[PDB]
Amino acid sequence: FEAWAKPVQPFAIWPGVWYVGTENLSSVLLTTPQGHILIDAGLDASAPQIRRNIEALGFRMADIRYIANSHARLDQAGGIARLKAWSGARVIASHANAEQMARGGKEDFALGDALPFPPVTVDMEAQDGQQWHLGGVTLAAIFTPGHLPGATSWKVTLADGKTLIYADSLATPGYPLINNRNYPTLVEDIRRSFARLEAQQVDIFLANKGERFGLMDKMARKARGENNAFIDKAGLARYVAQSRAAFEKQLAAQRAQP
């Protein structure tokens, strides 16, 4: 997690959308005249850098009204506790992420207690399709389980009409996929999530890890003048198609075991 947590200069993804995360751990600040929304928070060790990034852009922590979480593991929810204690924002997450966040990431269906992080109490438990309206911006929950029982993707309708999807992970490394004791609906959930994300209309494709939406390349191009570097209308469909191909290959292999 050292390389992924290396600091990066914050920058504008698009008017009202700012990248404040690390080299590969996404954290996105959505700014409005009525307050701000932060999506994900890196590691607990990332929280200070994320706060500094937000303040380096010219914004203050007190104005953040909502912290939203994709999935409750230490590299996406790890910094939420401290960013919450610095901003007074309310945390938004699915019920399943809320439970795992309360136990500090323990009792992970796949990881057990291996990778804990500071516990957080979710303030608003999101339902699939639930909306939050903030200064002309609209935040919508898209339940995309599979990677975790409560894995959540986020759709943002911006003040200018552009649509932004923050895609959660669809990865299953080392997962027991067949008759999984702790997550019996895993395969059914992740396939429905493939269809759900592939159906989204999208102007701006982001994700919980920079590698999944080409953060580094698009950042370089926008720095060099390409103002539309993060307009990526085919990126989400490509991300799903590749995730699906990888998932079904892993499942076929497990199904072929003696």
Laid out side by side, the sheet with 90-94 consists of 11-14, 17-19, 28-30, 36-39, 64-68, 90-94, 124-126
C-alpha separations of 195 from 78, 142, 257 in Å: 29, 12, 27
Question: What structural domains does the chain harbor?
Answer: 1-258 (3.60.15.10)
Q: What number of other Cβ atoms are within 10 A of residue 180's Cβ? A: 14
Distance of CA 57 to the CA centre of its chain: 21
Sign of CA dihedral 9, 13, 19, 23: negative
Contact 79, 46 (CB under 8 A): yes
Tokens of 222: 């926008």
> Smallest Cα–Cα separation from 121: which of 102, 96, 105?
102
**Cα 51 from Cα 23, distance rounded (Å):** 15
Method used experimentally = X-ray
> Smallest Cα–Cα separation from 138: which of 168, 161, 114?
161
**Cα 228 from Cα 240, distance rounded (Å):** 22
Name residues whose C-beta falls within 8 Å of residue 62's C-beta, 6 or more positions apart in sequence: 87, 88
Task: Tell me the HSE value of 172 on the side-chain side, using a 13 A CA sphere.
Answer: 27
Tokens of 163: 């649509």
Give resolution in angstroms.
Answer: 2.2
Contact 216, 207 (CB under 8 A): no
Task: Tell me the HSE value of 43 on the side-chain side, using a 13 A CA sphere.
Answer: 14
Scored b (16 or more CB within 10 A) or e, 50-82 reads bbebbeeeebebebbbbbbbbbbbbbbbbbbbb
C-alpha separations of 42 from 31, 59, 81, 122, 257 in Å: 19, 19, 11, 17, 36
109 CB burial (10 A radius; 0-12, 13-18, 19+): middle
Task: Tell me the HSE value of 110 on the side-chain side, using a 13 A CA sphere.
Answer: 15
